Amino acid sequence: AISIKTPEDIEKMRVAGRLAAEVLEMIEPYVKPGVSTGELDRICNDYIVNEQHAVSACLGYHGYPKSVCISINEVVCHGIPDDAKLLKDGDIVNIDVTVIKDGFHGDTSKMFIVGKPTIMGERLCRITQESLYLALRMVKPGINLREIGAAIQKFVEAEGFSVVREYCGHGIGQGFHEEPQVLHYDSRETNVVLKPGMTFTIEPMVNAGKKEIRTMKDGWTVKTKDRSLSAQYEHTIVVTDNGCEILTLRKDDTIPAIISHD
Ligand SMILES: O=C(NO)c1ncc(-c2ccccc2Cl)o1
Ligand SMILES: [Mn+2]
Ligand SMILES: [Mn+2]
């Protein structure tokens, strides 16, 4: 049973998605050489709780001890904010935010490049966002998720990069993770024909080297097996009658919030 959101549910998800985007807009000017990831997480959690009057879905999730996940360079996902970990020139950094507001979740992440970019870091990030945007342009009633996952994979692999298989996007609303799974690669198991009112995330994790990953002994931090760079972007969307609506769009996105077909 994939849940179908009511109009009221969808407006709540606009609110929550807007707050999650706004955390990312807020944190931008702090993402500078020399800042700790510990400090970035405090700035985020203080903003979520004291200004947005919302809650982080990440905090305490399976015992996770911080409020956002911050994943630098070869860290693929779930990087733990750390007062001792300082950003530096050329770093690529994912900040992943999920807020709960009025009972509903907004989930989004983006890359930041710190200081002076490296060309490869810039390319990896660009192609990862472009794979998300290609997928968003496909979402409409009647399309199969499988076609989307296949398309993401084809695009990323042509650039000589790889798609992480172990993580996927997901349904979302009153639960952080709801059906369906949104694989970013082709699988004979995927057969979900989209309908208006479905809400879910698309969030490909792309490695510059090989697809395999490894979890660290801390129980949280996931890295590329080959220590290649890895990048991720994520939006929360609703399927509309003629396409979709991006609920976590930021000023810096370069795709329209409302995508119509016909
Ligand atoms: O869909 C997600 N992010 O976009 C998500 N799923 C699981 C987790 C998680 C895993 C380990 C630590 C903290 C968190 Cl938030 O994040
Ligand atoms: Mn997320
Ligand atoms: Mn997610």
The CATH number of the domain where 170 resides is what? 3.90.230.10
Tokens of 148: 């989307």
- The CA distance from 99 to 176, in Å, is 9
Residue 225's alpha-carbon distances to 89, 94, 192, 208, in angstroms, are 23, 18, 31, 11
Report the separation in Å between the CA atom of 59 and the middle of ligand 1, taken as the mean of its atom positions: 10
Ligand 1 closest atom vs CA 177? 1
Range of the domain at 117: 1-262
Question: For the chain, what is the domain count?
Answer: 1
The answer to whether 122 and 111 are in contact (CB under 8 A) is no
Closest residue CA from atom 15 of ligand 1:
58
91 lines ligand 1 (CB under 6 A): no
* Torsional sign, CA 60, 61, 66, 67: negative
Which of 37, 70, 170, 176 should be mutated for ligand 1, with most atoms under 8 A from CB?
176
Report the separation in Å between the CA atom of 176 and the middle of ligand 2, taken as the mean of its atom positions: 9
Report the separation in Å between the CA atom of 220 and the middle of ligand 2, taken as the mean of its atom positions: 15
Residue whose C-alpha is closest to residue 67's, from 110, 96, 24, 107: 96
Specify the experimental method. Answer: X-ray
- The CA distance from 228 to 256, in Å, is 32
Residue 14's alpha-carbon distances to 4, 98, 101, 210, in angstroms, are 15, 13, 10, 36
Backbone angles phi, psi at 201, to 5 degrees: -110, 155
Tokens of 236: 């929360």
41 lines ligand 1 (CB under 6 A): no
- The CA distance from 127 to 205, in Å, is 11
Annotate the chain with three-state secondary structure.
CCCCCCHHHHHHHHHHHHHHHHHHHHHHHHCCCCCEHHHHHHHHHHHHHHHCCCEECCCCHHHCCCCCEEEECCEEECCCCCCCCECCCCCEEEEEEEEEECCEEEEEEEEEECCCCCHHHHHHHHHHHHHHHHHHHHCCCCCEHHHHHHHHHHHHHHCCCEECCCCCEEECCCCCCEEEEECCCCCCCCCCECCCCCEEEECCEEECCCCCEEECCCCCCEEECCCCCEEECEEEEEECCCEEEECCCCCCCCCCCEEECC
Report the separation in Å between the CA atom of 106 and the middle of ligand 1, taken as the mean of its atom positions: 13
- The CA distance from 130 to 256, in Å, is 14
Note the resolution in Å, 1 decimal: 1.5
For the packed helices 37-46 and 7-27, what is the interaxial angle rounded to 10 degrees? 140
Ligand 1 closest atom vs CA 109? 4
The answer to whether 194 and 180 are in contact (CB under 8 A) is no
Residue 180's alpha-carbon distances to 22, 89, 100, 192, 199, in angstroms, are 26, 38, 20, 8, 9
Residues measured by CB to lie within 5 Å of ligand 3, the ion: 107, 201
Report the separation in Å between the CA atom of 97 and the middle of ligand 3, taken as the mean of its atom positions: 9
